[PDB]
Structure formats: C-alpha cells, structure tokens
Amino acid sequence: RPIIAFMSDLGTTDDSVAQCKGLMYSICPDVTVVDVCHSMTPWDVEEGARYIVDLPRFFPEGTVFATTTYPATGTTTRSVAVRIKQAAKGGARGQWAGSGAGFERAEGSYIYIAPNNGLLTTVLEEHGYLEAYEVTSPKVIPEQPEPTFYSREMVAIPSAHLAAGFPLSEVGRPLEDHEIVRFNRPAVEQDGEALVGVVSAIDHPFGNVWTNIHRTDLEKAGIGYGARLRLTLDGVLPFEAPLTPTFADAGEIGNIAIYLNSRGYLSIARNAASLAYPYHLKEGMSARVEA
Amino acid sequence: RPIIAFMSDLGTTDDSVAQCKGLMYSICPDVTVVDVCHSMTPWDVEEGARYIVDLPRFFPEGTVFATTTYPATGTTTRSVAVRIKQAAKGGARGQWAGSGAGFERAEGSYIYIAPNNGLLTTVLEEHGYLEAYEVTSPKVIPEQPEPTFYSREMVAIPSAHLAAGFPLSEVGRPLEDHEIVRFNRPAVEQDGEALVGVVSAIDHPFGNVWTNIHRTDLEKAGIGYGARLRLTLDGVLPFEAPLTPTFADAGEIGNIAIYLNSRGYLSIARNAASLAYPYHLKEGMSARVEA
Amino acid sequence: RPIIAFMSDLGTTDDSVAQCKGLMYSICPDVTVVDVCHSMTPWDVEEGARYIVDLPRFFPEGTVFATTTYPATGTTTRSVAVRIKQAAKGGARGQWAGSGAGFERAEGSYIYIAPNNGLLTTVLEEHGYLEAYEVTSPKVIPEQPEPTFYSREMVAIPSAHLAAGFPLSEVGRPLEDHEIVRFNRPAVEQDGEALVGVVSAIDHPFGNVWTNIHRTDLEKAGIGYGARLRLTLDGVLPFEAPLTPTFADAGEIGNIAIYLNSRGYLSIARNAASLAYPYHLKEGMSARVEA
Amino acid sequence: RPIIAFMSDLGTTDDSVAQCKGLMYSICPDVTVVDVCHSMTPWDVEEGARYIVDLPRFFPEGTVFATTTYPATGTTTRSVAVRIKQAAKGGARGQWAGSGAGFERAEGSYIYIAPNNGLLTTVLEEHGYLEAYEVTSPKVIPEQPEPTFYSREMVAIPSAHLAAGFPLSEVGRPLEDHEIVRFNRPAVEQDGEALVGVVSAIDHPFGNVWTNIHRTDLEKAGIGYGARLRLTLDGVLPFEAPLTPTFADAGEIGNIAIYLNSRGYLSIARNAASLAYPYHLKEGMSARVEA
Amino acid sequence: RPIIAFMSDLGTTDDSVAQCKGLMYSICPDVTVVDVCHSMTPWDVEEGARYIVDLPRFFPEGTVFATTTYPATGTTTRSVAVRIKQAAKGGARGQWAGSGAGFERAEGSYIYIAPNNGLLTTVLEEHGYLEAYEVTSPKVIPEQPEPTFYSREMVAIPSAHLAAGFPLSEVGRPLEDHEIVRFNRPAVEQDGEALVGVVSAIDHPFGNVWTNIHRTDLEKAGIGYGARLRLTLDGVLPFEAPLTPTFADAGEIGNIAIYLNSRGYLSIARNAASLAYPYHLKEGMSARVEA
Amino acid sequence: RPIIAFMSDLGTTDDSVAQCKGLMYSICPDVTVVDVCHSMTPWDVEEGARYIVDLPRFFPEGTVFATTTYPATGTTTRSVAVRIKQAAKGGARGQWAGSGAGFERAEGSYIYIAPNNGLLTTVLEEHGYLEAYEVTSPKVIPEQPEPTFYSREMVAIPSAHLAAGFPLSEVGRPLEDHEIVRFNRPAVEQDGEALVGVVSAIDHPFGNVWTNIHRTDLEKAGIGYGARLRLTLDGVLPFEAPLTPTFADAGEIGNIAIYLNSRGYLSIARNAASLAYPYHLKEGMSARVEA
Numbered sequence A, B, C, D, E, F: 001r002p003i004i005a006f007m008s009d010l011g012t013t014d015d016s017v018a019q020c021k022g023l024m025y026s027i028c029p030d031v032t033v034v035d036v037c038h039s040m041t042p043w044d045v046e047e048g049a050r051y052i053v054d055l056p057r058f059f060p061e062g063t064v065f066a067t068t069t070y071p072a073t074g075t076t077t078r079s080v081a082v083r084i085k086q087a088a089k090g091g092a093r094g095q096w097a098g099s100g101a102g103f104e105r106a107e108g109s110y111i112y113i114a115p116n117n118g119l120l121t122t123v124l125e126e127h128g129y130l131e132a133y134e135v136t137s138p139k140v141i142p143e144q145p146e147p148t149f150y151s152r153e154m155v156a157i158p159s160a161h162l163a164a165g166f167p168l169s170e171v172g173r174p175l176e177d178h179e180i181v182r183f184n185r186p187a188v189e190q191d192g193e194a195l196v197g198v199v200s201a202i203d204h205p206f207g208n209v210w211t212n213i214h215r216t217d218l219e220k221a222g223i224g225y226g227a228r229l230r231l232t233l234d235g236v237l238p239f240e241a242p243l244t245p246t247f248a249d250a251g252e253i254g255n256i257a258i259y260l261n262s263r264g265y266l267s268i269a270r271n272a273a274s275l276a277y278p279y280h281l282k283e284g285m286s287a288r289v290e291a
C-alpha cells in the first residue's frame, strides 16, 4: 500500500495532475496518490515549502512526497531525492499527530523528491536528512523528458518508482550538502522586548494571518498562552489580545484572536470571521509582537 | 474497501486536507477517502449541510461521512457521530441512485461525524437517525488536540477509526436528541397562490439558481411539470417559463428554464448559459413563485 | 485494478462530483477514481476535449475515461462509449510517456464514455476507435435518469460498469461514424507566410499562452527551434523571441519564451513569470506568427 | 454674454479641456464656457449625440454648442458648423424649458460645431437646420492644426470665433445635406402588440435604464400613463409595472417604476434605488415592452 | 455679480447639469455658476448635506446655494428656499475664511434652495435661518414640471430667479420650522471613556478617514492635541498615534496621522499616502477612539 | 477679466474645490476660474507637473495658474509664486496655439503659484522664470491657515489676490534658485541607435501610451514622420509602425499608431481603440524607440 503525497504548482484546471497520476499508477499499480495541493503560486518555492514541511508526521512511514514547482524545467537540472531523518513533531504544542498520544513516526521513514531548487529547504532544516541523491537514472526518469514538464518527468515519474520500491541510492549520485540548493529564511529578529517577523501566509479560506514568529521565538521571549500581546501588522496596525489557544477565546464572533496556528506559529485572526480579506492584509507585511 | 467521504471548509490551497487524509490512511490503511468538497464558505453550517444531506444513497453501505466546518474548534465542544436511519430516495422524482432501478440502501448503513454545531441538521431531518454519540474517547481523538484544527482532531481522525471498524457506540456517551444542535430552516410560505422562499444556492459552476421551494411545496399549490410560472428574484427581477424537467426544454440556448433540480427543488436557469452570473444573482435573494 | 479517469464540468464546490464517485465505488468497488479536472468552462466541448485527448498514454491499460459536459442533459440524447485504437504518443517531440523509453500502450486499451455532443472529437481524431456504442442499457444507466444530471446518470454510472468489466458492446447498439457528433476545429490559416491561429488556451496557473498553431504548422512553414519569431496576439500585442524548447531558454526571469508546449503547439510565456495575466490575454484572441 | 457649451470625449483627468477653454477665453474674452460633459466613451458618436441633442431649449439664444469626439483627428476631414432650425420642445410632455410656461426659443438661435462624423445626426433630425458650413477658414482654425487634437483645433477654437461673432457663413463653404455624415438609428419595431427596442443608455449615476422606445412609439400601441406593462431586458430579465410619471409612483423604495424619462423615452428604474447596477444591466441590451 | 453654487446628484456623465446651467444663465444672464460637486451618492441626503453645510463663509455674500438630491421628484413635494442666518466659522480651529484674519460674512447673506427632504438639516442646524419658504410660484418653477427632473425644475430654475433678485418671500408661502424635513444624525455615544462613532466619510481622493467624532466630543473627553489615541475602525482595525494638526506630523511618508479635518472632526490618515484604499475602509464603519 | 486656471489634487467629489473658488470670487470678484483638473494622483508632483507645464500658450496673458498638490500642508513650508519667462510654443511641431498662425504670447506674462515642492519643476525648466517669491504675506494668505488645507490657504487664496492685481514681489521674499525645490527628471538615454525612456502617462480616457521621449530626442536621432520605428514597451512588446502624425494613419480601426502627441512626445496608440486599457499598460513601463 504505497502512498505518494503529491504537491505541485500544476493547478486544478487541466489534465496536468492527472497525467502525473496516470504515470504514478502505471509505475506503482498499488499506489495511493494523496493530493496535497496544486494551487501554490507558481515558482514560489518558499510557499511550496510551507505546504510540504509538516507532512511526514501525518503519513504512514514509507510515504513518498512528490513535491514540485519546476521553473527550471527543460534544463540540465535534475531533481533531488532525499530520505529525511526526523519525521518531527509539530503543531502549537509540538506533538505527534493522531488519536491518543499520536503516531510516533520512525526516523529515516520518508522520502521527498523535488526539483533541486530550494523547495525542500525547510523540509531539510526541520527534519534533517540521512541521504540525498540526484535523480538521473533512466530507470526512474524519461530518457527524453518533456522540456516543459519536469514536474511530471523528474518528480512524478521517479516518485512512483520510489514508491514501488526502487532503491533511493540508485536514482543517481549522492549529493553533498552544498549541492542541495537552499533559499534563505529571514530570521525573526529580537528588536527590544519585541519579536520582529513577517506575515508569512494568509491562511485560506479563512483569512487568518500567519506569521513566521514561532512558538520557540515566543517561549524564549517568555510569551505563553495568557500573555497580553500587542501584535503590530503592516507597521501601523497594533492588535491587542491575549495569546489564546483558539479563535473562540476572543469571545464574540469577529473579535481578534492572537494564537498559535497548527504549524506552531504566531497567528492572528478573528473569531469565526475573516481578518485578512476585508482589509486586504497580505503575506510579506511586517509582524512585530511584544508583551 | 471502507470509504470516508470528506467534506470540509479547509480549502484546496494548502496541506490541511492532506494532513487529514494522511491520518485517515494511517488509522485505516485500506480506506478510500472521497472528497466531497472543501471550498464551502467557512463557518456556514447551512451551506455545508447542503453538500452532505443527499450523499448517502450514492455511497456504498458502511460509508462514513466526515463533514466539518468547525468554528468552535479548540473549545470543550465535541463532535457528534450518528448512524442515520434511511439513506432516503432523492432527486426530482425521488428514487434510489444508480443504474436500473437504483441501488436500494439498507437502513442504518451510514455514519456521519461532524461538529455538533447544526451541520447535520438536514441530514437528521431527511434520513432520521438510529443512534448518536458524543465523540470523546481518546481511542478516536487526540489526547491533546490541536486547538485550531478540530476538523482534523475531532472529525477526520475519529472518522478514520469509525471506518477502521471502531464500534460507533464506543466513541463517547449517547447524545439525547435535544443535545444535537440544529439550525432553523426558513419555511416556504404560502402567500395567496404564491410560494415564497429564498435563493438557497447559486449552482456553481453553471450559475443556475436553486431555491428552497421543494417539489412537495409545488404539488401543494397544484404545480407540476408544464405549468406556466412567474418566478421573481430579489423582489424585482421576475421570470416566466413553464416548469420543465431539464434545461433544454427552454428551447434556444440562453432561454429561461424553470425546473426541479437534482435534489428536488424549484430552480431557474438559462439553457446552456449562466443565469446567476451576468445578473449577479446571489444566495439569500427572495424567490417567489406563482402559477 | 480498475481506473476511471474523471473529467467533468461539475466543479469542485458541491457534492456533484462526490455523488458520481460514490456510485462509481458502489458499482466497481475496487476502482480508483482519478480526477482529471472538474473546472472546465461549462458546456465548452472544445475545452473539455483538450483536457482528455492526451490522457490515454499516461494511464494503465484498461482505464476508462468518464468525460462529460452534458448541456443536453434530460433529453433523448444518449452517451456514446468508444474503445479508442492507438493510445498515441504526444508531447513536443511525440513520444510514449514514462521513465526509460517510456511505456508503450497496446491498441484498444481505453474506453471513453461521454455525451454524444462532440466532446470526443479530438480523442477520435487523434486516437481512432475500434468500436462505438450508444449507452442505453438499463444495466448501465438508470431507468429513471435524473433529468438535469446526465453527467452522473449517463457517464459516471455507466463508466463504473465499464470499469467493472461490463462488456462494452452490451451498453447499447453500435453507432455508425456519422452518428458520433463532432465539432469543427478552425484551421490555422495562411496570410502571406504568417500563420494565423488563435489563443486556444491560457495555460493556468502559469499564464502561458497556448495557440492552436502546431509543431507541424511551423515546420511545414520552415520554422524550427532557434528561429526568430514575431508573435502578435489579439491583433495588437507583439512579442519576438527565438523558438526554444523551454522557458528558461529566455534567460532572465520574466523574459519572453516562444516554445512548443507539452501538447506540441506554439506557445508563448515569460520565463518563470506570468505572461497572460498582467496583459489580460485570453483564449480566443488571434495569434499571428511569422519568421 | 456669449456661451459655448462644450461636450467632448477629452476626459476630466488632464489639461485637455483646459487647453480648449484657455483658447476659448482667448478668442472670445466675454465668453462663458459651460461644460456639458467630457466623460463620453471615446469615439462613440451615438452616445455623444445623446448628450447634445436636447441642449438647445435650455440655453439662451445665440449659444454655440462645441460638441466633439474626433477619431478622424489629423485627417483632411473638417468640422461642420450648423445653425439649427427649431430649438424644439422636449421632455415627457414636450414643452419649453424654464419657469412658468417655459422659455420659447426663436428659430435659428443655436449653432453646433462638430466633427463631421455623424455626431450631429440626432441634432439635425430633431431640430432641423437652416445652414451648414464646412469649417476650413484659417480665421477660425489653426493653419497648422495639432494632428491628434482636432477637438481643440477644429471645434473648440472655431466655436470661440463663432461665439465671438465670426459670421457663420464665413467659416467655410456651404455643405449640402448629403455631405453631413449621419449615423443610422435603430428603429423601434412593432412585434405583434410588443415594441422592441434597446437599452439606449444606463442613466448614471442612478442606474436607471433608458430605452430608445419613445412616448410617440408608446401612444402608437395605445400606451399611456397607467398601463400595466411587461418590459423584458437582455431577452430574459422581465419587469412588470404600470407606466407612471415618476419613480415614487412605484411606492416603496426599491420598487420597479416604468416611466417616461426627461427626454421622452420609456425607461425603467427602481424607486430611489439603482436598477442597472446590482444586475449589471447594460446599454445595448434588448428591451421589449408589451401591454 | 450673482453666484449660484450648485451641488447635485446629477453626476458628471451626461447633459443633466448642463441643462440646469443653461436655464440658470437664461434666467440670470450675469450669473456665475460654481459647481460644488455632482458626484454624491444619489439620494444620500446626509452625504449631500456634508458638501454644502460649510460653503457660506467661502462665498461672496448673496450667493445662492442650489443643492439637490431629489428622490421625491415628480411628487407633490415642493422645494424649500431658506435665507440662512450666520455664515458661520469652521475649520479645525473655528475661523472666518480668507487671507488676513479672514473675511467676515454679514448674517442673512445666503439662500439655500433644496428639496424639502432633510438635505438642509445640517445647514439649518449650523447656520440658523431668517426665513424659509415653499417654492411654488410659477414665476420661479415650471407650470408643467418634468416629473423626473425636480432637481432642475424645483432647484436649478428657481435658484437662478433667486440669484437674479427675485424676492425670496414671493417664491411661495412661509414654512413653519416643523414643515422643514430634518434627518437625525446619530450621536457619538459613550462606552467607558471611549468615544464610539462612525466613519462619516472616506475623504476622496486621499483615502483619509473622517469620523463623526468632533473636536468638541474630544475636548469634552479631555483629548487635546498631543494625546496618544487608539483609533479602532470597523470594530477590527486598530491604529495608534498622537492627535496632531496635520499629516506631515506623522513623520515618514505613510505613517499614521490622527488629526482634526478641515471640517473639525477626528480623522485618520497616512502621511502623503492613502489609508482607506489599501484597507478598503468605508463610510459607515464604526470608529472607536480612546486615550 | 482676470483668469485663474486651477489645477489641484482635491478631487471632484466634495466641496474642496468650491471652497477655493468661493474664496477666489470673494477676493477677485471679476475672476474667471478655469478648472484644469482636480483628479491628479494625490501627491504625485511629477503627474501634476504634466497637467500644468503646457498651459501658458493657451491662456490670455496675465493668467494666474493656481496649481497644487500639498502633502506638506500644515507645516512651515510656504508656496512659491513665480513669473515665468517664455510662454513657450508646443505640440508635435512646436507652434503657438490658436487659429491662423496662433496666439504669440509675450514673455513674463504668466504667474504660477504652487507649493514649493517641485510641482513647478518642468514649468521652470521649460518656461524659465523672471522672479520667484515665497508666499508669506498676511495680505495674501490666512494668518491662521487651516493645517490640512494649504491648497486653499497657500495657493487658492493668494492666487486670487495675484489675479486681483496684488504685486507679485510683495507676496514675500524673493527666492534664490536653489530654494525652489525641483524633482529630478530622468533623461532619455542614448543606448545605441535607440532612445530609451519610459511610459510617462497613460492618456485618459483613450488609453493612448505617452512616453517621455521628446520630438527633440527623435529629431537628433534623425527620426521624423515616415520613419519606420520599433517602439518596445515594457521590455517585451515591440511595436512596429511608421511614425505618423495621427491615429488614422494606421489605417483600419484598432491598428497601431506611433505618433507625436499634442505635448510633443513620442506616443503609441491604436486607431480609434484603446491600446493601454485592454492590456493594462501603465506609466513607468520602459519605452525604447529605434529606427
């Protein structure tokens, strides 16, 4: 029962994803293809990273993550296939996912395959890796790859072989760490008592505002649930609420909640109302938080 | 062979649904997860209800419906899990779904699990139920649920246990009928000869206009197929057409068709043209029909 | 391991696709339903055709394509079910899909079931067919089909029977060629030595512009890779670039690439930037190319 | 004391109109320049005609109307200057404008100067004319006119000379009637009992809907104030109301009023609410009235 | 040198305002018509009132304000014409307007003529009046007024007569105070020591936000310039700044300024940037201020 | 008969402009106020400059240009009042404006009064100046200026005094050239045979594209009417046409015209169609022209 969890920038409007999947079932008949999402901003590797980084703990060990935005499609670039180390806890607390105490996931239990364009930056940062290979073997990629469709040729296709039991180390040569492209993650800076970050994401479809200010950034400033915060967005929008676990703690529908999102990050929202949408709050806006 | 049909407000733009599915495949390795849709207006329980009420007769017996919009996520609230009674005939004529004479579905064959926020109102109204349980057992939900993600913790996760054969009566204590939250459904009023309802939905992607005026409401003012009807929307934009089975009966493309939709309700459309969109017709607009 | 690849105009916003899938699993329990897309412009048979024409080669043999926009729903019209002949190579070079030299598909290995409304025009043209039948048997369609939902009644339900091994020739009588509705595709017309076609698609989500000017139209005009092209769109907007295999060949991010798409047609893009969106380029705009 | 009323497509966003006015005050120091409007759809002669046809009876005798959209700017074309015959009664009843019994205007009291591109079609149709001259004399136009600004050179400038008392017959040679460009006006057709016209204008800023069905057309099918009428727009959106003098006769705010507008034409509106805007009703939509 | 200052809801897109002006010049040839604005939300008497209430002090004595939105056009309603009492100081400090110490205006120096529909509510409140009359005399209005155009018939035309020296008291009978329709203005309400009002206007084209919280409301709460204010808008968006005289006091371009507008009310802006537009702030949003 | 030509950023939607004008008539009873435009992008001094720079030749000598966007309102900044030197020819040719050979305007014949914020940069660059004074005298400005309305206090008010004959040199102290704020005009660069500039303006309401590439830039590259040009916009849109005097020279409606606009600058448009609007071409886009 192999699983490919499939995240791409291919959209939901044509047969692009179906082509990949058709090939996945062709190569790995017993595969279950699980869509992550296909609507990421094309070529936004940092956004794509966000949709794939917290996946492992939710999936059975041995799951293969075929994750791709491939702007360098048709070039001599080749994908990277990595076996991660830690599946890694997560969420507002830092816990295993599932009922009871959650599913503890073994180490070295997930493979990601992606363009080597930095899409896996946070995956490697947060999970670490045991081994990483360039995907070159004609056994797992086309000998004549479609130039404009490396997401299919260099990710979907080899992902299905990996899911089918194709040995990871046989995809091509091992890559040294410096050969794995990374994008830079701008740090949350200490600017006084304040933590200064950005709006990392508008949380669709709700219009919640996600920051790159992590629980760990907060914990080491002393900020926990109950702490009375000023969260300033866009330089000019204080917001003031206690840090609370959830939206409803804000009381009346529409009230401001400052909370920790399911990924573990400082967030702001309204209670059963959209914060971001009516006021056109966007990713990239500044986010400062002080107690 | 078990099936969970999954309806949420989680959107299709990030890994939220994928996190749920990964846990569903984790808990119930043989499961098939069928998306209903994930694009409902967040927190709009009445709209979510529309997407799930007609589902049972389409699905194999034993299907679990994991249905969720969870505005009260992170609160002490707990989901309700119900075995419905009748799968119930549906459509313009009221029939079993499928080839030949349709597939008759044994009673008690489907479980819904949902926030106990009234999402299941029309499910219970239309199918009845045999048993209802609060979902509280740590065998089916996290001991430390993500405060902001009860749709995962309190729906997706225990739905997978239910699909995996976890005895329904073991999820929590039985709920009495008055403990199951219901929303109020606006009645269709008789106003003289007229029937007064509402545009209950714009039928995307076609821009057909669905009202809450049922066929039973029509055959109460004498109205069957063939009847010249006047249908006014938003109080001002009126329409005249016979009540016909389908769009093409309007004749020319763009012509107004008044019909019964596939859920049995008085609707208005253009034949192979959008009615709602050019005129920005919206859900919530008054709808009056008179013969 | 039966597969139904499912392409409809049903959208992704309600339970319509789920109703179809439920019945698919009801009828063929071991089936895997693979979504192609569901977001096509309703009733645009030419567009629906693009999303289905090059599917066969990507899918395991025996795959059934359930492909439907059904504007004549509720009429006396009946679907056509065809077994196509050659699975047919594609891409910018014309190959079999997959790793290695790709995966050859035996002839007569795929069935399409569709409204008989021309949706299968390009499938038949490109693949040929071995047998075509009207879908009328109450073994495979409802005796009382829902008038407004033939996509489910006359495509979804019967496709599942076909996926389950119901003999194709027993679905109804054989259709002669002339009985299979076709749409006409406008030809690429000559104007001096310029090729005049149309923008056949904006390739979402990338904003690439696809024209109906094929590789054959080009190399029949002595235009090969490396050729300096002037591409005018909408009779106004001119672009000049050499013909190149892929986007990154344009050089800097945002530079114009004129290339052949993964479907084999003259297309235009910005490199890792969206061309169509900032300029509000649309399907149906004229496209003129010249050396 | 001379007045030039100035209607152009020059917009209100730059100094274009101001350049015209400066020259108008330069040439005719005592002049009063009255803006009609400057926001007409560029090059839409029929729309510009609407803005100028009803003007004469409102203005003191001797007023010059400088009316211009000039798509043929910079060509050998020359403006036409005409002394109209009758100032003509107007409105729903047809009357002189002003207090008491209105201000009767002597015949031959108004001059229009315009591109000879049909802008004056309805002016001539409704007022008749006494004399018409091509505007060519270097005493009233630049010897070296700005190619792209004939609205200034060939309208604003000579209009100011005319206001300054430059003899009209001295502007150029007389034009014969066939040399004055006219546009074709769609006739109002009798279709059974119905009258078929068009939405001739959306009446901004109110979103009232003006048709080209005249009161004379109405009192030809027997229709006067009080008559229950059915009015359909865009073929599909029909409306029923008595024909009433004014909006408030509809009773409640938002209620449909069918009336004769201030230019004598069958119109539809809501009472103190916008009709056109919520429904995106547009000029050019068919309009059928039947009693 | 008679002046009519003209404020209507007639828009700037057709000949409506020009028809009025033509008649104004017909009746009072030496008149200067000064446009206030013509773009007010149709029928929004409260909004119309804002554009006219502080005019008198800026205008030469004897100016007539012809001020009209006329939703009850064509009814038995007649306009009111009033001579106001004190021309009344204004601004953020309360002064006479002009160079030097400004220009004092004699009392009883201005006439407003308007629908009797409350448009003059704040004019009367702020200025008082010496005399008020119903406008009925066929000397100043048409005997056959155009039903849909009372703004012209019952405001424009009679204002020109008044501008021309037609005795005010001869326009019709005197109206008692109670006969002059007033609208109610919602009060700034107390909540703790916070002032709760509304966004009374988005100050176009700047995107400044004007509230109905007046200088008096503030310094009645012990809020003076230099006071640190928290201004929450729409019950969501918080801003903090000291109260300052002007925008540039915020410092950097784009910084928040909370200030008193040139009309004397608490307002909020970005310095030389638009506040309202990026945040889609609207008139009618709640505005809460607190020290 | 003094004239104030009045250009501001005050908009057309409230009483702001009327206040200024009221004061202008108060101070200079016999004044004619001529609106330039009031809809400039607030605080965009370069845009405002464009609306005022070519004004003088169109106006009678002695005209006063009250031109203002005043983001530094309420500060210790004071306006500059300048008497220009050359009225300066203009247009595609470089000619005097008016009928015959045009109105030659004497030198030193126009005064501009503006904030000293660089709004007059091009005015001074193109016309030169004879004298310039800071506007400080309480005879021409308020002693207590409205902080947020320096466009009225420091421009409209003193402009009316200047129009009334108030001696220019008495407004305040002479300013040295270095005290007159200028904005930088980026030069058109010679990059080969090419002239590289920008899109300086979208020419509303037509959607023509104006560049800052001047006839003088062209003449000294040898480019005149008839020259076959490639005009590349936005780096990726060649356009190719001869440089022609006017739009119609492009032939068919919608054809590309490259021409010299009425201000003397290289421009591109379609013939009686909008170039900029359908494709969302904007100011600030690159503009290269080569023969």
Ligand SMILES: Nc1ncnc2c1ncn2[C@@H]1OC[C@@H](O)[C@H]1O
Residues within 6 Å of the ligand: A009, A010, A042, A043, A068, A069, A070, A071, A072, A073, A148, A149, A150, A151, C206, C208, C247, C248, C269, C270, C271, C272, C273, C274
């Ligand atoms: N204009 C463009 N530029 C660069 N890459 C593009 C592109 N359009 C699609 N792709 C890539 O092709 C493989 C997909 O993943 C997508 O990122």
Ligand SMILES: Nc1ncnc2c1ncn2[C@@H]1OC[C@@H](O)[C@H]1O
Residues within 6 Å of the ligand: A206, A208, A247, A248, A269, A270, A271, A272, A273, B008, B009, B010, B042, B043, B068, B069, B070, B071, B072, B073, B148, B149, B150, B151
């Ligand atoms: N701002 C908000 N307020 C309340 N509930 C929210 C919310 N954002 C997401 N959810 C709920 O979190 C679980 C999802 O199903 C969603 O309904």
Ligand SMILES: Nc1ncnc2c1ncn2[C@@H]1OC[C@@H](O)[C@H]1O
Residues within 6 Å of the ligand: B206, B208, B247, B248, B269, B270, B271, B272, B273, C009, C010, C042, C043, C068, C069, C070, C071, C072, C073, C148, C149, C150, C151
């Ligand atoms: N207004 C309309 N006119 C014609 N066909 C319609 C329609 N709405 C839905 N359908 C068809 O019903 C089956 C779906 O595939 C869809 O194409």
Ligand SMILES: Nc1ncnc2c1ncn2[C@@H]1OC[C@@H](O)[C@H]1O
Residues within 6 Å of the ligand: D206, D208, D247, D248, D269, D270, D271, D272, D273, E009, E010, E042, E043, E068, E069, E070, E071, E072, E073, E148, E149, E150, E151
């Ligand atoms: N649909 C409508 N309802 C009510 N009044 C209207 C209207 N259209 C224009 N007017 C009024 O006619 C005089 C103008 O001032 C305008 O307010």
Ligand SMILES: Nc1ncnc2c1ncn2[C@@H]1OC[C@@H](O)[C@H]1O
Residues within 6 Å of the ligand: E206, E208, E247, E248, E269, E270, E271, E272, E273, E274, F009, F010, F042, F043, F068, F069, F070, F071, F072, F073, F148, F149, F150, F151
């Ligand atoms: N938010 C703002 N910031 C700076 N100046 C502003 C402003 N709103 C209006 N003005 C200026 O006030 C005088 C007008 O000319 C305008 O430019």
Ligand SMILES: Nc1ncnc2c1ncn2[C@@H]1OC[C@@H](O)[C@H]1O
Residues within 6 Å of the ligand: D008, D009, D010, D042, D043, D068, D069, D070, D071, D072, D073, D148, D149, D150, D151, F206, F208, F247, F248, F269, F270, F271, F272, F273
């Ligand atoms: N692109 C274009 N094509 C044709 N005429 C145009 C044009 N832009 C402005 N004008 C005309 O130039 C004089 C104005 O009145 C306007 O109609």
